[PDB]
Design a protein around this nucleic acid. Structure first.
Ligand SMILES: O=c1[nH]c(=O)n([C@H]2C[C@H](O)[C@@H](COP(=O)(O)OP(=O)(O)OP(=O)(O)O)O2)cc1F
Ligand SMILES: [Ca+2]
Ligand SMILES: [Ca+2]
Length: 424
DNA sequence: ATACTCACACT
DNA sequence: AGTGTGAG
């Protein structure tokens, strides 16, 4: 089990929200700029940042006022606001564009609003046969980096050198060499990527490997507007100094405990442990997944799902803004059920499916976790009023206030979610 | 208080 | 069912 069965790619929309607004407003193209939401507070929090703006140190979670301190010629687009909260329609819609083009080439998994995994095992098999036996022109990979290769002084210099090496050592006669499949996979991704940009104007990076995690790690190595092949053979040296926290799902607490317990720092340092040990420290499934991953093996399938599994509407009310009156909780649930209803009706008409479960979650001042309480009822009709009232019914009892007009403790968050979808 | 999203595991 | 993690 060498984990070279599949060709898997993870494509990612370079500063997606910023590209979207930059396509709409040319006055913003190729400048330092960024997208924000809610300009009243500290100029708005920063959700996406161009690569010009990034050369000045500007990042996500920055206030725009703090970003302007680092970059005074930084341009700003603000997220649409509808009904008192941020409306993301524009960006969901722009994703839909990208995702539909990708599904022309292979079956994709929407991982996020702006990245999809692709399984190319099958597409590569087709391309191999129509390719008789001829070599792969370097010209077929004009934006592809080969990891660990080469082994000049300007960047594109070295990218040619490494691609030339890779291709030169390529065994194009054997149609089963995993390194050949990786290559063709990537040639397809150049095509796939070439079509995204011609047809949308959006640029994107991609990672090409054998499983979902490597695909994603590879994709971050050579951003923006480039794609990186990570062969199986580049993994020992890639992982030799790769920080554990850089692998998907190891950015969190689990990854932190991998580090403290075993006293290590880098993905490759896990190879020194037997599976039984890794299973003893982190569980049967984490030890197994970790044992396989330090060696570049992960079997997580690319799941066919170009479409989400839930539709969620949320607002936070930090600080003095926390809803303290019964009537207010009604008015924001009403706002929520409204964007929910309007978004759902498009989902039934665009995708032939209905939801049946309403999820209602709220946060409470003083509570430390994202959600303080989730509740659920049945969702029967796409009516804003029914939905907010029903959201209210299932949460009134949490009002600790004796008075009926107040709400204590003040609410710091309201969350609604349509789940459990079904064919219409 | 970036803030608002989504998937999935665990129980 | 709810809760919690990890990610965008
Ligand atoms: O926390 C978040 N909140 C949040 O709204 N988004 C939104 C904004 C972003 O444009 C889009 C994609 O997220 P990315 O993490 O991939 O960042 P990009 O801006 O696309 O650039 P790149 O991948 O580095 O080239 O989702 C991401 C978050 F991570
Ligand atoms: Ca992206
Ligand atoms: Ca992304």
């Amino acid at each position: 089990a060498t984990g070279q069965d599949r060709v898997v790619a993870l494509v990612d929309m370079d500063c997606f929200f910023v590209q979207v607004e930059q396509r709409q407003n040319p006055h913003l193209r190729n400048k330092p700029c960024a997208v924000v939401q809610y300009k009243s507070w500290k100029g708005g929090g920063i959700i996406a940042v161009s690569y010009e703006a990034r050369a000045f140190g500007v990042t996500r979670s920055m206030w725009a006022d703090d970003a302007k301190k680092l970059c005074p010629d930084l341009l700003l687009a603000q997220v649409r606001e509808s009904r008192g909260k941020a409306n993301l329609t524009k960006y969901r819609e722009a994703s839909v564009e990208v995702m539909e083009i990708m599904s022309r080439f292979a079956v994709i998994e929407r991982a996020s609003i702006d990245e999809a995994y692709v399984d190319l095992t099958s597409a590569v098999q087709e391309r191999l046969q129509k390719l008789q036996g001829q070599p792969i022109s370097a010209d077929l990979l004009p934006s592809t980096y080969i990891e660990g290769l080469p082994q000049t002084v300007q960047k594109e210099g070295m990218r040619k050198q490494g691609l030339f090496q890779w291709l030169d050592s390529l065994q194009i006669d054997n149609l089963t060499s995993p390194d050949l499949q990786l290559t063709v996979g990537a040639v397809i991704v150049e095509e796939m990527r070439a079509a995204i940009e011609r047809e949308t104007g959006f640029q994107c990076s991609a990672g090409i490997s054998h499983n979902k995690v490597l695909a994603k790690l590879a994709c971050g190595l050579n951003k923006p507007n480039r794609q990186t092949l990570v062969s199986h053979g580049s993994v020992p040296q890639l992982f030799s100094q790769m920080p554990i926290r850089k692998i998907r799902s190891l950015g969190g607490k689990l990854g932190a405990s991998v580090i403290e317990i075993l006293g290590i720092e880098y993905m490759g340092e896990l190879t020194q442990f037997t599976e039984s040990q890794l299973q003893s420290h982190f569980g049967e499934k984490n030890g197994s997944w970790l044992y396989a991953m330090c060696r570049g093996i992960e079997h997580d399938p690319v799941k066919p799902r170009q479409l989400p599994k839930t539709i969620g509407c949320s607002k936070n009310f930090p600080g003095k803004t926390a809803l303290a009156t019964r009537e207010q909780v009604q008015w924001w649930l009403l706002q929520l059920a409204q964007e929910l209803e309007e978004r759902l009706t498009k989902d039934r008409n665009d995708n032939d499916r209905v939801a049946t479960q309403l999820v209602v979650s709220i946060r409470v001042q003083g509570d430390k976790r994202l959600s303080s309480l989730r509740r659920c009822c049945a969702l029967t009709r796409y009516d804003a009023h029914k939905m907010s009232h029903d959201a209210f019914t299932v949460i009134k009892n949490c009002n600790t206030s004796g008075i009926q007009t107040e709400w204590s403790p003040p609410l710091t968050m309201l969350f609604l979610c349509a789940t459990k979808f079904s064919a219409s």
